[PDB]
Design an enzyme around this catalytic site. Structure first.
Site, mmCIF file in Angstrom:
data_model
loop_
_atom_site.group_PDB
_atom_site.id
_atom_site.type_symbol
_atom_site.label_atom_id
_atom_site.label_comp_id
_atom_site.label_asym_id
_atom_site.label_seq_id
_atom_site.Cartn_x
_atom_site.Cartn_y
_atom_site.Cartn_z
ATOM 1 N N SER A 89 44.699 41.637 44.003
ATOM 2 C CA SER A 89 45.745 40.713 43.587
ATOM 3 C C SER A 89 46.863 41.604 43.058
ATOM 4 C CB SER A 89 45.217 39.732 42.535
ATOM 5 O OG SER A 89 44.578 40.432 41.477
ATOM 6 N N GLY A 127 36.029 33.712 40.079
ATOM 7 C CA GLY A 127 36.366 34.482 41.264
ATOM 8 C C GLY A 127 36.708 35.901 40.858
ATOM 9 N N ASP A 177 28.698 29.785 43.868
ATOM 10 C CA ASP A 177 29.874 29.159 44.466
ATOM 11 C C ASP A 177 30.542 28.295 43.403
ATOM 12 O OD1 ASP A 177 31.701 27.496 45.896
ATOM 13 O OD2 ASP A 177 30.315 27.234 47.574
ATOM 14 N N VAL A 193 42.576 34.016 38.747
ATOM 15 C CA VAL A 193 43.578 34.892 39.341
ATOM 16 C C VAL A 193 43.274 35.036 40.826
ATOM 17 C CG1 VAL A 193 44.524 37.213 39.372
ATOM 18 C CG2 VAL A 193 44.013 36.072 37.184
ATOM 19 N N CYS A 323 48.930 44.521 55.408
ATOM 20 C CA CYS A 323 49.810 45.132 54.410
ATOM 21 C C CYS A 323 51.258 45.155 54.878
ATOM 22 C CB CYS A 323 49.355 46.553 54.082
ATOM 23 S SG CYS A 323 47.765 46.607 53.220
HETATM 24 N N1 LIG Z 1 33.779 29.339 46.138
HETATM 25 C C1 LIG Z 1 33.827 30.520 45.516
HETATM 26 N N2 LIG Z 1 32.927 30.776 44.537
HETATM 27 C C2 LIG Z 1 32.977 31.949 43.905
HETATM 28 N N3 LIG Z 1 33.809 32.971 44.112
HETATM 29 C C3 LIG Z 1 34.686 32.694 45.081
HETATM 30 C C4 LIG Z 1 34.767 31.523 45.818
HETATM 31 N N4 LIG Z 1 35.804 31.589 46.737
HETATM 32 C C5 LIG Z 1 36.321 32.780 46.533
HETATM 33 N N5 LIG Z 1 35.685 33.503 45.557
HETATM 34 C C6 LIG Z 1 36.008 34.839 45.069
HETATM 35 O O1 LIG Z 1 37.302 34.805 44.518
HETATM 36 C C7 LIG Z 1 37.863 36.140 44.572
HETATM 37 C C8 LIG Z 1 39.274 36.059 45.123
HETATM 38 S S1 LIG Z 1 40.002 37.715 45.236
HETATM 39 C C9 LIG Z 1 40.522 38.079 43.535
HETATM 40 C C10 LIG Z 1 39.433 38.693 42.667
HETATM 41 C C11 LIG Z 1 39.929 38.943 41.237
HETATM 42 N N6 LIG Z 1 40.375 37.647 40.649
HETATM 43 C C12 LIG Z 1 41.092 39.939 41.252
HETATM 44 O O2 LIG Z 1 42.234 39.439 40.872
HETATM 45 O O3 LIG Z 1 40.921 41.104 41.631
HETATM 46 C C13 LIG Z 1 36.898 36.981 45.411
HETATM 47 O O4 LIG Z 1 36.032 37.686 44.538
HETATM 48 C C14 LIG Z 1 36.043 35.934 46.127
HETATM 49 O O5 LIG Z 1 34.734 36.466 46.339
HETATM 50 C C1 LIG Z 2 50.521 38.100 46.699
HETATM 51 O O1 LIG Z 2 49.894 39.362 46.667
HETATM 52 C C2 LIG Z 2 48.638 39.367 47.301
HETATM 53 C C3 LIG Z 2 48.315 38.339 48.183
HETATM 54 C C4 LIG Z 2 47.083 38.344 48.824
HETATM 55 C C5 LIG Z 2 46.172 39.372 48.580
HETATM 56 C C6 LIG Z 2 44.807 39.348 49.301
HETATM 57 C C7 LIG Z 2 44.287 37.943 49.488
HETATM 58 N N1 LIG Z 2 44.017 37.354 48.117
HETATM 59 C C8 LIG Z 2 42.657 37.578 47.608
HETATM 60 C C9 LIG Z 2 41.588 37.073 48.561
HETATM 61 C C10 LIG Z 2 41.800 37.633 49.928
HETATM 62 C C11 LIG Z 2 40.650 37.750 50.772
HETATM 63 C C12 LIG Z 2 40.783 38.272 52.033
HETATM 64 O O2 LIG Z 2 39.656 38.391 52.869
HETATM 65 C C13 LIG Z 2 38.573 39.058 52.287
HETATM 66 C C14 LIG Z 2 42.024 38.676 52.481
HETATM 67 O O3 LIG Z 2 42.146 39.193 53.768
HETATM 68 C C15 LIG Z 2 43.386 39.744 54.099
HETATM 69 C C16 LIG Z 2 43.140 38.558 51.674
HETATM 70 C C17 LIG Z 2 43.005 38.021 50.362
HETATM 71 C C18 LIG Z 2 46.494 40.407 47.699
HETATM 72 C C19 LIG Z 2 47.739 40.401 47.060
HETATM 73 O O4 LIG Z 2 48.103 41.426 46.172
HETATM 74 C C20 LIG Z 2 47.280 42.561 46.250
#
Ligand SMILES: Nc1ncnc2c1ncn2[C@@H]1O[C@H](CSCC[C@H](N)C(=O)O)[C@@H](O)[C@H]1O
Ligand SMILES: COc1ccc(C[C@@H]2NCCc3cc(OC)c(OC)cc32)cc1OC
Ligand SMILES: Nc1ncnc2c1ncn2[C@@H]1O[C@H](CSCC[C@H](N)C(=O)O)[C@@H](O)[C@H]1O
Ligand SMILES: COc1ccc(C[C@@H]2NCCc3cc(OC)c(OC)cc32)cc1OC
Ligand SMILES: COc1ccc(C[C@H]2NCCc3cc(OC)c(OC)cc32)cc1OC
Ligand SMILES: COc1ccc(C[C@H]2NCCc3cc(OC)c(OC)cc32)cc1OC
Lengths: 348, 347
Positions: A89, A127, A177, A193, A323
């Site tokens: 993120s 998450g 979940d 987040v 990216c």
């Molecule tokens: N139904 C669900 N239950 C639990 N986790 C979930 C979910 N759907 C998505 N996620 C989790 O939500 C996360 C979104 S990505 C962001 C991860 C963390 N908040 C960060 O900011 O780095 C991933 O870990 C994905 O595994």
């Molecule tokens: C707006 O900035 C962003 C937008 C999207 C992202 C990545 C995006 N969000 C988390 C879950 C997620 C999961 C994915 O598959 C595993 C994914 O594939 C590209 C993309 C993402 C990352 C970002 O910043 C790093």
């Protein structure tokens, strides 16, 4: 359509980075022209109608078991592409010299400030990914008890391994979940987040999360968005490669910066901020640079993990395209089209 | 210099097309004051403004001296306003829609959007001379319609109309809405052009929410700027408009999304806007009717205010008000200042 053949040229690494960037600029202009309306009456009607449509949907898509490959990411690859905390993120860039690692910590300290985190609180990280924020908060506030929720066994293993290495005793990771999770525990502070991007029915989502907020507790949500309009990711015309290439079979939603204001039946807004698309744009540039600077190791990781040179190339190409395209999208109009929305909610 | 210009105004000595020119200057300064170069800044301005309202009283209590600025003689309203005496904008299907038609179009739109069903209990807060109260009572004879106003002359006019029209389903309560307390609940509550008198919207909606029956709805209409909110403070030392149009005690120009930040006790069900062309066209009609009947208007104001000079001052005020606000709401094809309608359920 020959969208299929263009996609096969992408998957084989035949399409240049500048061509991908140009393709995304066209897609951006199509989406902006589709979303913007000549009158505010129409603009608002489009958003409210969209919001109302989410209220009749499932909370989230049931992910197909056959699409597990689109969700599991090898840990050695994340160690290369992401910063030190494996934040999946955006980071916060104070200027274009801020490093990826710095941007991760800058953003997480911004979360702690805006979410009014204090030592001793119970914290829920919904998450939680590979634990960037869970571990950030647990390390910073030794009196806090931090619970993270993820549906990924490998994410949970990694975080518990980090807890061992960092000698933390104030972290618990629940493997569940979130859309099915039943708990009677309430928490002083909840983080969501980059989780909303997986959801559809925000109303059902926030109803469930609201039951987990303690009395006088707070919920902090960050979602990427368009400033003005929201949409489902569906092809704009018969030439749309983007929706087919980037997203899985199920349909997902791009929020708008104001859309959660229409979902205040069970929580209500304490504060609402946005951050420029420049921050995610810079983040994706750093992800791409790290991938390219370590391409030989990335190749070995993906060839090992995916089982062939061909399939490895396909997934390396995917992440590079992801990216490139999203750096371009978030950069649009000096960061003032797609951006980040942060919302702080209280219960009731 | 502003006080000199205002005295020129109150005597009727500056023409119309330059009243528009001066308001266009005022408009450009307000828009330049309000807009910010980034969305981060624009949103922060709104959220900060909303929080500031929560530190205010619900509404300013109106003094004895200033009754002249709120009492409007009924014979004047019969001239200026349409047949229902709607003191709020109409809906213009085109620029040939008459003032009378626009009032009915808009009130039928309120009934549609508030999901009025025959037999419901209806509360009309700040009912004025009863445009909507009498419209609903006659359209839905199974409804019981209650109107609240703090004006004796408004209540008297409505009750006279109920006698003339043989309406048995209307009650008017003479009360200050900001102090009103009741154990009665209502299926539908209307607040049309009432929140423009309020400051702390949180206290206002908190009180009104207790009056909403089980599964009832509250319908609010407010004029607004599309993007930003503000108090009517002069912009610099050359701002005559704020001093000339508004009474002492400060009022608020809301923004179209500002009530979205006031959902502690009600929840937004729907939200619409209508462009500034509608109020712009209505103010042009108000001005035309004033001008076409100016001698009678002079007769009414001379009787009520007691002199030719004071009558001229108040006639000039209403003309300038219509000219200035027709110009303001027309800005950028009606895409700056406009109308916001919000439908709430109880939370
Ligand atoms: N139904 C669900 N239950 C639990 N986790 C979930 C979910 N759907 C998505 N996620 C989790 O939500 C996360 C979104 S990505 C962001 C991860 C963390 N908040 C960060 O900011 O780095 C991933 O870990 C994905 O595994
Ligand atoms: C707006 O900035 C962003 C937008 C999207 C992202 C990545 C995006 N969000 C988390 C879950 C997620 C999961 C994915 O598959 C595993 C994914 O594939 C590209 C993309 C993402 C990352 C970002 O910043 C790093
Ligand atoms: N505190 C208060 N209590 C009761 N009525 C009030 C009030 N403050 C303002 N009002 C009334 O609110 C009205 C605003 S003008 C709108 C009148 C009517 N809704 C219409 O659309 O025609 C005026 O009638 C004024 O008398
Ligand atoms: C946006 O369209 C309008 C905006 C404002 C108005 C008039 C405004 N609102 C009601 C209370 C009110 C009361 C006033 O004095 C008693 C007044 O004096 C100009 C003006 C108003 C009328 C409007 O349409 C007719
Ligand atoms: C909720 O947000 C998302 C969730 C999942 C995804 C699917 C995506 N995950 C990473 C790897 C990958 C590889 C692919 O084919 C090589 C592919 O083809 C469609 C899609 C994906 C994208 C998301 O938002 C862009
Ligand atoms: C709530 O909205 C309002 C309520 C009251 C007013 C005051 C206004 N009422 C009509 C007559 C009049 C005459 C004046 O001087 C001749 C005057 O001078 C300042 C002001 C007024 C304006 C409002 O919004 C523009």
């Amino acid at each position: 359509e020959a969208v299929a053949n263009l996609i096969k040229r992408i998957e084989h690494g035949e399409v240049s980075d500048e061509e991908i960037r140009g393709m995304m600029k066209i897609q951006v202009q199509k989406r902006l022209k589709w979303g913007y309306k000549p009158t505010h009456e129409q603009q608002l009607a489009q958003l409210v109608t969209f919001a109302q449509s989410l209220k009749g949907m499932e909370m989230a898509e049931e992910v197909d078991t056959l699409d597990a490959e689109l969700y599991e990411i090898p840990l050695p690859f994340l160690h290369i592409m992401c910063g030190k905390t494996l934040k999946f993120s955006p980071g916060y860039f104070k200027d274009e010299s801020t490093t990826l690692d710095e941007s991760e910590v800058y953003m997480m300290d911004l979360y702690c400030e805006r979410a009014q985190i204090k030592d001793g609180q119970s914290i829920l990280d919904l998450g939680c990914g590979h634990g960037s924020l869970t571990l950030h908060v647990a390390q910073k506030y030794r009196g806090c008890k931090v619970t993270g929720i993820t549906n990924s066994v490998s994410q949970k293993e990694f975080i518990m391994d980090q807890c061992k290495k960092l000698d933390l005793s104030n972290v618990e990771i629940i493997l569940e979940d979130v859309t099915k999770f039943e708990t009677e525990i309430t928490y002083d502070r909840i983080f969501a987040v980059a989780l909303i991007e997986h959801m559809k029915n925000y109303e059902l989502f926030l109803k469930k999360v609201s039951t987990w907020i303690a009395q006088d507790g707070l919920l902090f949500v960050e979602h990427h968005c368009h400033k003005v309009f929201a949409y489902q990711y569906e092809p704009l015309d018969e030439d749309d490669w983007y929706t087919e290439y980037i997203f899985p079979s199920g349909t997902l939603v791009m929020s708008s910066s104001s859309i959660l204001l229409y979902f205040q039946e069970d929580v209500s807004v304490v504060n609402h901020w946005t951050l420029s698309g420049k921050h995610p744009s810079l983040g994706f540039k750093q992800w791409l640079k790290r991938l390219d600077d370590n391409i030989d190791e990335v190749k070995e990781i993906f060839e090992s993990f995916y089982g062939s040179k061909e399939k490895a190339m396909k997934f390396i190409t995917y992440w590079r395209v992801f990216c490139i395209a999203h750096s371009q999208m978030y950069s649009t109009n000096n960061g003032e089209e797609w951006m980040l929305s942060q919302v702080l909610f209280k219960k009731k």
